[PDB]
């Protein structure tokens, strides 16, 4: 009988843009990983709150791509004072645990066909192999209408099953209700938490979380839900795996890195040692601000060295070659 068209309020758009502006300005002497984490948090909050309205809104997509490009330009400026051309996207979009920044994308980024080739040498000789668009969040996020209808349906299912279980004197097992694991606005997952009995006495939690803004300085993007009561309303393991595959499989990603230089026989039993440096990372001490800034730059040094092979080429930077002394 009627149709409801949705959009994101211009006020919310402006708030998100100002959040990105604050991230950039306060970036200052901070780290690339922290900048990317702030961007990921902001984007996840916006995209999980305004699910369909973002797609319906033709200005918010442009704003999102503009802010993402600004963030990428900040990273590149930090990398070097001269703007390159056709910078590779692997460094930005590679998962954190694999040496990348683990950036979350919301635009239409086309990976050049060139970057996906990778070589491998063994006793036989050298063999060359190949493997597309970066996955977008909107596909992996689920629409609110579907969420609501499926929630009604699944909770009716649970009511029926629970009545049957009380008839049988038993408790509902994880084996039953299994097909309904992640479904329901109050997620079925929350039904198995240890502290459910304690949480049963928590009231006004939503308004309390909303009001927290007057007590805690930090901005909470998830000011409208609590992981404890509503459960986790999204899931991105699929997105991470598809990001790896689109970037071209683990070998394709590692081709750009220095991993082959380390000469490790395989990439299985390796592990990063975060925040160690040459001085044990000297995390606790009474050092001066300049010294602390140097330590905070050390991780950027490790990242730049790690991705140097794909960053240190004439295609990326126009030719002004200078041989390193000796």
């Amino acid at each position: 009988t009627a149709q409801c068209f949705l959009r994101v309020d211009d006020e919310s758009m402006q708030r998100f843009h100002n959040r990105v502006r604050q991230i950039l300005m306060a970036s200052g002497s901070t780290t690339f990983t922290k900048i990317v984490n702030k961007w990921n948090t902001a984007l996840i909050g916006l995209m999980t709150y305004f699910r369909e309205a973002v797609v319906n809104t033709q200005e918010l997509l442009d704003l999102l791509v503009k802010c993402e490009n600004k963030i990428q330009t900040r990273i590149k400026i930090g990398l070097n004072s001269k703007m390159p051309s056709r910078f590779p996207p692997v460094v930005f979009y590679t998962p954190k645990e694999l040496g990348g920044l683990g950036m979350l994308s919301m635009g239409h980024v086309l990976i050049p066909q060139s970057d996906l080739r990778w070589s491998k040498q063994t006793d036989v000789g050298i063999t060359h192999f190949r493997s597309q668009l970066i996955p977008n969040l909107y596909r992996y996020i689920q629409p609110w209408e579907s969420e609501f209808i499926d929630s009604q349906r699944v909770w009716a299912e649970y009511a029926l099953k629970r009545q049957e279980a009380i008839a049988q004197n038993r408790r509902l097992t994880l084996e039953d209700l299994e097909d309904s694991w992640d479904r329901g606005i109050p997620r079925i997952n929350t039904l198995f938490q240890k502290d459910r009995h304690t949480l049963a006495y928590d009231k006004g939690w939503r308004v309390r979380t909303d009001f927290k803004q007057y007590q805690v300085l930090k901005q909470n993007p998830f000011w409208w839900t609590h992981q404890r009561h509503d459960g986790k309303l999204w899931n991105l393991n699929n997105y991470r795996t598809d990001m790896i595959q689109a970037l071209g499989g683990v070998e394709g990603i590692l081709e750009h890195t220095l991993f082959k230089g380390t000469y490790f026989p395989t990439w299985e039993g390796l592990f990063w040692e975060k925040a160690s440096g040459f001085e044990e990372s000297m995390k606790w001490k009474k050092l001066t601000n300049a010294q602390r800034s140097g330590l905070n730059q050390i991780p950027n040094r490790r990242f730049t060295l790690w991705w140097s092979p794909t960053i240190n080429r004439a295609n990326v930077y126009v030719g002004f070659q200078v041989q390193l002394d000796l």
Binding site: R21, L24, G28, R74, T288, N289, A290, S293, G294
Partner: protein
């Protein structure tokens, strides 16, 4: 006002530079009435009593003492130079030249870091030091 001591001739300048043995000598070359020099002098006055332990500041009017213009390339409105035991120290600010400052900064905290780093490098013996920040960009966002 500018209660900071002022040097009136090359003789006074060189005597002041050589007088100190364990404190970095800071010299602001420029005209006191230029607004850039006004801002720089304000910051230096603020940080004087803070860095009195290991630094001493002085101000030179370019017109009053023009002999050093050619050798030290003093042609910009305001410049700041650092010396230690008759040695001119260089700083890798990233601006392109590591000899002088040649512009006015506004953050006394960063000025304090520059003084500390220059003093530490001079005591460690380096003729050139690396500032703990890059000014190639104006970091405005």
């Amino acid at each position: 006002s500018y209660m900071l001591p002022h040097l009136h001739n090359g003789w006074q300048v060189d005597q002041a530079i050589l007088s100190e043995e364990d404190r970095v000598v800071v010299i602001r070359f420029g005209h006191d009435w230029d607004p850039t020099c006004m801002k720089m002098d304000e910051v230096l006055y603020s940080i004087a009593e803070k860095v009195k332990n290991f630094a001493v500041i002085y101000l030179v009017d370019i017109t009053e003492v023009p002999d050093f213009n050619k050798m030290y390339e003093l042609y910009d409105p305001c410049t700041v130079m650092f010396f230690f035991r008759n040695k001119h120290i260089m700083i890798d600010l990233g601006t392109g030249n590591n000899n002088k400052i040649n512009w006015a900064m506004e953050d006394k905290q960063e000025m304090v870091d520059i003084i500390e780093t220059v003093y530490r490098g001079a005591r460690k013996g380096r003729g050139l030091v690396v500032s703990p920040k890059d000014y190639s960009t104006k970091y405005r966002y």
